[PDB]
Amino acid sequence: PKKRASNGRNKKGRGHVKPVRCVNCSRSVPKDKAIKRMAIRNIVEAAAIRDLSEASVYAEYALPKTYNKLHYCISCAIHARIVRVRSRTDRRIRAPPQRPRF
Template sequence: MPKKRKNRGRHKGDKGKEPMVYCDNCGKLVPRSKAVRVTVPYSPVPGDLARELEKQGAIVPRYYVTKTYCINCAIYLGILKVRSEDERKRKIASARPLVRRETVAAPPATKPAQTQPPTQPTQQGNEGAQTKS
Protein backbone atom coordinates (compact mmCIF):
# COMPACT_ATOMS: atom_id res chain seq x y z
CA MET A 1 0.00 0.00 0.00
CA PRO A 2 1.51 3.39 -0.98
CA LYS A 3 2.33 6.00 1.64
CA LYS A 4 0.54 9.34 1.49
CA ARG A 5 3.45 11.24 3.04
CA LYS A 6 7.16 10.51 2.91
CA ASN A 7 7.66 11.29 6.62
CA ARG A 8 4.45 9.46 7.63
CA GLY A 9 3.07 12.74 8.99
CA ARG A 10 5.66 13.07 11.75
CA HIS A 11 9.04 14.68 12.35
CA LYS A 12 10.67 11.88 14.31
CA GLY A 13 12.36 10.14 11.39
CA ASP A 14 13.83 6.83 12.55
CA LYS A 15 14.26 7.65 16.24
CA GLY A 16 11.91 5.09 17.80
CA LYS A 17 9.19 6.06 20.25
CA GLU A 18 8.48 9.56 21.44
CA PRO A 19 6.26 11.06 24.16
CA MET A 20 2.55 11.54 23.62
CA VAL A 21 0.80 14.83 24.42
CA TYR A 22 -2.85 15.73 24.88
CA CYS A 23 -4.71 18.06 22.53
CA ASP A 24 -5.86 21.14 24.44
CA ASN A 25 -9.10 21.28 22.46
CA CYS A 26 -10.42 17.71 22.31
CA GLY A 27 -8.10 15.78 24.65
CA LYS A 28 -6.85 13.33 22.03
CA LEU A 29 -3.42 11.71 22.57
CA VAL A 30 -1.08 12.78 19.78
CA PRO A 31 2.65 12.09 19.16
CA ARG A 32 4.65 15.14 20.18
CA SER A 33 6.18 15.62 16.73
CA LYS A 34 2.79 15.46 15.05
CA ALA A 35 1.08 17.95 17.39
CA VAL A 36 0.71 21.59 16.36
CA ARG A 37 1.99 24.03 18.97
CA VAL A 38 0.73 27.62 18.95
CA THR A 39 1.92 30.37 21.29
CA VAL A 40 -0.67 33.11 21.82
CA PRO A 41 -0.60 36.19 24.08
CA TYR A 42 -3.11 36.18 26.93
CA SER A 43 -4.06 39.16 29.08
CA PRO A 44 -6.27 38.85 32.18
CA VAL A 45 -7.52 42.43 31.59
CA PRO A 46 -10.14 43.06 28.84
CA GLY A 47 -8.83 44.87 25.75
CA ASP A 48 -10.76 48.16 26.09
CA LEU A 49 -9.85 48.49 29.76
CA ALA A 50 -6.21 47.64 29.00
CA ARG A 51 -6.00 50.46 26.41
CA GLU A 52 -7.36 52.99 28.89
CA LEU A 53 -4.96 51.84 31.60
CA GLU A 54 -2.00 52.07 29.21
CA LYS A 55 -2.97 55.65 28.31
CA GLN A 56 -2.79 56.52 32.00
CA GLY A 57 0.67 54.95 32.24
CA ALA A 58 -0.16 51.64 33.90
CA ILE A 59 1.61 48.47 32.85
CA VAL A 60 -0.81 45.73 31.82
CA PRO A 61 0.69 42.22 32.03
CA ARG A 62 0.59 39.90 29.03
CA TYR A 63 1.28 36.23 29.38
CA TYR A 64 2.22 33.90 26.55
CA VAL A 65 0.33 30.61 26.59
CA THR A 66 1.43 27.66 24.45
CA LYS A 67 -1.44 25.49 23.23
CA THR A 68 -1.03 22.03 21.71
CA TYR A 69 -3.53 20.82 19.12
CA CYS A 70 -4.04 17.64 17.15
CA ILE A 71 -4.15 17.97 13.36
CA ASN A 72 -7.96 17.76 13.22
CA CYS A 73 -8.45 20.59 15.74
CA ALA A 74 -5.73 22.74 14.12
CA ILE A 75 -7.49 22.51 10.76
CA TYR A 76 -10.90 23.11 12.35
CA LEU A 77 -9.65 26.21 14.21
CA GLY A 78 -7.98 27.60 11.06
CA ILE A 79 -4.40 27.27 12.30
CA LEU A 80 -3.51 24.93 9.43
CA LYS A 81 -4.95 24.88 5.93
CA VAL A 82 -5.74 21.82 3.84
CA ARG A 83 -3.16 21.66 1.04
CA SER A 84 -3.25 19.79 -2.23
CA GLU A 85 -0.82 16.97 -2.99
CA ASP A 86 1.40 19.23 -5.08
CA GLU A 87 1.64 21.84 -2.31
CA ARG A 88 2.47 19.16 0.26
CA LYS A 89 5.35 17.86 -1.85
CA ARG A 90 6.80 21.31 -2.61
CA LYS A 91 10.12 21.99 -0.90
CA ILE A 92 9.84 25.78 -0.57
CA ALA A 93 8.06 27.32 2.41
CA SER A 94 4.68 28.75 1.44
CA ALA A 95 4.62 31.33 4.26
CA ARG A 96 7.66 33.20 2.93
CA PRO A 97 6.95 35.86 0.24
CA LEU A 98 8.71 35.27 -3.07
CA VAL A 99 11.34 37.83 -4.11
CA ARG A 100 11.56 38.72 -7.77
CA ARG A 101 15.10 38.59 -9.02
CA GLU A 102 14.54 41.20 -11.77
CA THR A 103 13.77 43.96 -9.27
CA VAL A 104 16.62 43.04 -6.95
CA ALA A 105 19.34 42.61 -9.59
CA ALA A 106 18.40 45.61 -11.79
CA PRO A 107 20.88 48.52 -11.56
CA PRO A 108 19.43 51.87 -10.52
CA ALA A 109 18.38 54.10 -13.42
CA THR A 110 19.67 57.33 -11.83
CA LYS A 111 23.34 56.25 -11.80
CA PRO A 112 25.49 58.96 -13.49
CA ALA A 113 27.55 57.87 -16.47
CA GLN A 114 31.35 57.97 -16.17
CA THR A 115 32.92 60.75 -18.23
CA GLN A 116 36.57 60.29 -17.21
CA PRO A 117 38.73 57.81 -19.11
CA PRO A 118 40.24 54.98 -17.06
CA THR A 119 43.59 55.89 -15.49
CA GLN A 120 46.87 54.14 -16.24
CA PRO A 121 48.33 51.96 -13.46
CA THR A 122 51.29 53.49 -11.65
CA GLN A 123 54.81 52.12 -11.95
CA GLN A 124 55.20 51.58 -8.19
CA GLY A 125 53.06 48.46 -7.82
CA ASN A 126 53.87 46.94 -11.22
CA GLU A 127 57.69 46.97 -11.21
CA GLY A 128 58.04 43.25 -11.83
CA ALA A 129 55.17 43.05 -14.31
CA GLN A 130 56.74 45.13 -17.09
CA THR A 131 59.75 43.89 -19.06
CA LYS A 132 62.15 46.04 -21.08
CA SER A 133 62.91 45.03 -24.64
Protein backbone atom coordinates (compact mmCIF):
# COMPACT_ATOMS: atom_id res chain seq x y z
CA PRO A 1 0.00 0.00 0.00
CA LYS A 2 0.99 3.66 0.16
CA LYS A 3 4.09 3.62 2.33
CA ARG A 4 4.12 7.43 2.14
CA ALA A 5 1.63 10.12 1.19
CA SER A 6 4.31 12.12 -0.66
CA ASN A 7 5.71 9.01 -2.42
CA GLY A 8 9.03 10.14 -0.94
CA ARG A 9 9.61 12.42 -3.92
CA ASN A 10 8.39 15.82 -2.74
CA LYS A 11 7.36 16.39 -6.37
CA LYS A 12 3.57 16.64 -6.03
CA GLY A 13 2.51 18.95 -8.87
CA ARG A 14 5.58 19.65 -10.99
CA GLY A 15 5.21 17.34 -14.00
CA HIS A 16 8.85 16.25 -14.16
CA VAL A 17 12.16 17.02 -12.45
CA LYS A 18 15.63 16.87 -13.96
CA PRO A 19 17.83 14.03 -12.63
CA VAL A 20 20.98 14.71 -10.63
CA ARG A 21 23.64 12.06 -10.13
CA CYS A 22 24.38 10.38 -6.81
CA VAL A 23 27.71 11.48 -5.40
CA ASN A 24 28.83 7.94 -4.46
CA CYS A 25 27.29 5.33 -6.76
CA SER A 26 26.49 7.73 -9.65
CA ARG A 27 22.83 6.69 -9.55
CA SER A 28 20.50 8.97 -11.49
CA VAL A 29 17.66 10.12 -9.24
CA PRO A 30 15.28 13.10 -9.51
CA LYS A 31 16.63 16.19 -7.76
CA ASP A 32 13.93 15.79 -5.09
CA LYS A 33 14.56 12.11 -4.25
CA ALA A 34 18.23 13.05 -4.30
CA ILE A 35 18.68 13.23 -0.53
CA LYS A 36 20.72 16.33 0.13
CA ARG A 37 23.49 17.46 2.45
CA MET A 38 25.35 20.74 2.90
CA ALA A 39 28.78 19.61 4.11
CA ILE A 40 30.25 22.85 5.44
CA ARG A 41 33.60 21.86 6.96
CA ASN A 42 37.04 23.38 7.32
CA ILE A 43 39.64 23.08 4.59
CA VAL A 44 41.95 21.77 7.33
CA GLU A 45 40.69 19.33 9.97
CA ALA A 46 39.98 20.59 13.48
CA ALA A 47 42.67 18.13 14.58
CA ALA A 48 45.59 19.94 12.91
CA ILE A 49 44.53 23.57 13.37
CA ARG A 50 47.31 24.18 15.91
CA ASP A 51 50.22 23.13 13.70
CA LEU A 52 48.89 25.19 10.78
CA SER A 53 48.30 28.15 13.11
CA GLU A 54 51.77 28.24 14.66
CA ALA A 55 53.54 27.89 11.28
CA SER A 56 51.54 30.64 9.54
CA VAL A 57 52.30 34.16 8.37
CA TYR A 58 49.37 36.61 8.42
CA ALA A 59 48.63 36.16 12.12
CA GLU A 60 45.16 34.71 12.78
CA TYR A 61 44.51 33.55 9.24
CA ALA A 62 40.89 33.22 8.15
CA LEU A 63 41.36 29.49 7.40
CA PRO A 64 38.66 29.22 4.70
CA LYS A 65 35.58 27.01 4.96
CA THR A 66 35.19 24.56 2.07
CA TYR A 67 31.63 24.25 0.74
CA ASN A 68 29.98 21.53 -1.31
CA LYS A 69 26.55 19.98 -1.76
CA LEU A 70 26.28 16.21 -1.50
CA HIS A 71 23.73 14.26 -3.54
CA TYR A 72 23.06 10.64 -2.61
CA CYS A 73 20.93 7.98 -4.11
CA ILE A 74 18.67 6.68 -1.39
CA SER A 75 20.48 3.31 -1.43
CA CYS A 76 23.74 5.07 -0.56
CA ALA A 77 21.84 7.19 1.97
CA ILE A 78 20.85 3.99 3.79
CA HIS A 79 24.28 2.40 3.47
CA ALA A 80 26.46 5.48 3.90
CA ARG A 81 24.27 6.15 6.98
CA ILE A 82 23.19 9.71 6.20
CA VAL A 83 19.64 8.49 6.79
CA ARG A 84 18.26 5.71 8.97
CA VAL A 85 15.13 3.60 8.60
CA ARG A 86 12.59 4.85 11.12
CA SER A 87 9.51 3.49 12.84
CA ARG A 88 6.07 4.12 11.39
CA THR A 89 4.68 7.19 13.15
CA ASP A 90 8.22 8.62 13.26
CA ARG A 91 8.09 9.08 9.48
CA ARG A 92 5.84 12.09 10.20
CA ILE A 93 8.61 14.25 11.64
CA ARG A 94 10.40 16.27 8.95
CA ALA A 95 12.33 18.73 11.11
CA PRO A 96 16.13 18.67 11.27
CA PRO A 97 17.35 15.90 13.56
CA GLN A 98 17.25 17.71 16.90
CA ARG A 99 20.09 20.19 16.21
CA PRO A 100 23.26 17.99 16.32
CA ARG A 101 25.29 20.74 18.02
CA PHE A 102 23.87 23.29 20.45
